[PDB]
Amino acid sequence: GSFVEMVDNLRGKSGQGYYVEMTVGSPPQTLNILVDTGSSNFAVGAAPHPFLHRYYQRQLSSTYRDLRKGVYVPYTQGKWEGELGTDLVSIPHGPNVTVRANIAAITESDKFFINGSNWEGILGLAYAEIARPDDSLEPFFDSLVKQTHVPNLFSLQLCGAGFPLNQSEVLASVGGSMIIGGIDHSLYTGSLWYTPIRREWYYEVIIVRVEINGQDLKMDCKEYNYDKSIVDSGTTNLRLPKKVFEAAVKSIKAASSTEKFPDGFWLGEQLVCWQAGTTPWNIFPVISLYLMGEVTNQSFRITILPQQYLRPVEDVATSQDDCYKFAISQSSTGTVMGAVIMEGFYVVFDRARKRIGFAVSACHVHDEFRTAAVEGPFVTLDMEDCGYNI
Ligand SMILES: CN1C(=N)N[C@](CCC2CCCCC2)(CC2CCCCC2)C1=O
CATH class of the missing domain: 2.40.70.10 (Acid Proteases)
Structure with a gap:
């Protein structure tokens, strides 16, 4: 570092x-x-x-x-x-x-x-x-x-604690790193994979495939980027285009079907709670987003865990239960890779080379059985068609 x-x-x-x-x-x-x-x-x-x-x-x-x-x-x-x-x-x-x-x-x-x-x-x-x-x-x-x-580059390591931070705790806790002008290698594990910045306005990227527990969501990839896909630390949730949200939630419900959650949970409005330490992480699926690579016909994937997409919230009773809100929600303005997704990765905004890099974060929350991942390469065809044009 x-x-x-x-x-x-x-x-x-x-x-x-x-x-x-x-x-x-x-x-x-x-x-x-x-x-x-x-x-x-x-x-x-x-x-x-x-x-x-x-x-x-x-x-x-x-x-x-x-x-x-x-x-x-x-x-x-x-x-x-x-x-x-x-x-x-x-x-x-x-x-x-x-x-x-x-x-x-x-x-x-x-x-x-x-x-x-x-x-x-x-x-x-x-x-x-x-x-x-x-x-x-x-x-x-x-x-x-x-x-x-x-250097015309900055990198962000956003660190979610994996549990609620009270007012005193969130003021005394380290929440991450913003490295201005460089990449600090102590902040990630494994390799950095880069996706092109499609156009310089928002940090726009192109998603070419989506999996829920390895199962292809199988939508026309242009749906994943309708009308754009951006990386945004100023948004909390992973926000998905209406049709994609509908398909993804259907698949996440199916993977987690051994437990029934109320409609309010899926709408990202109400919290769900489990007795201290018993959160059933394993019944929830991992989510993989494949991103266009820098090499023709090549893509890579970033995989997040429910420890990223379930956001820790304090129980309205301040009890000892571990509670969370579903941090995936719909959008009418495209996909937004918000803070809960960024918490799983060290993200490099390489403005100089017009590319965004992703690597597994040294501070992502996980369990003994699964970890977030950034893996590649994958042969992926016609990725340009995944981009949306008004
Ligand atoms: C989601 N988002 C964002 N990432 N930034 C803003 C503005 C977005 C811009 C985009 C370009 C046009 C002008 C507004 C502001 C909020 C950020 C969090 C704290 C409250 C305000 C927003 O709405």
């Missing part, structure tokens, strides 16, 4: 997000920032909010520059509005550099800030094409690379 200064620099959990410490302004103002590979704006709370105990104070920064421009960003579950400007930004447990970056000072929001998440802003790590108001607002990572010698 050659990047010790950045190892273990993340905190958080799949449901409320993983964050990294950053500083903004002169003198430096410390803020916890959500790592979001599914957006492209660096936006931080800049005004009092019930869920914030600190925020960016522009008037206290001598290096603050006002862009005299507003920004409005509505999203599925909510929205954030702010004022654009630039200032000096650093990552304490990151590369030893300071860069001038765009910052959206959030002045109004709805369903953005999460009570108790311990973060005050978000770091959009995707491409300028999806930056708001438009692609002229240079994303933080683009600025970082343009202004320093930092």
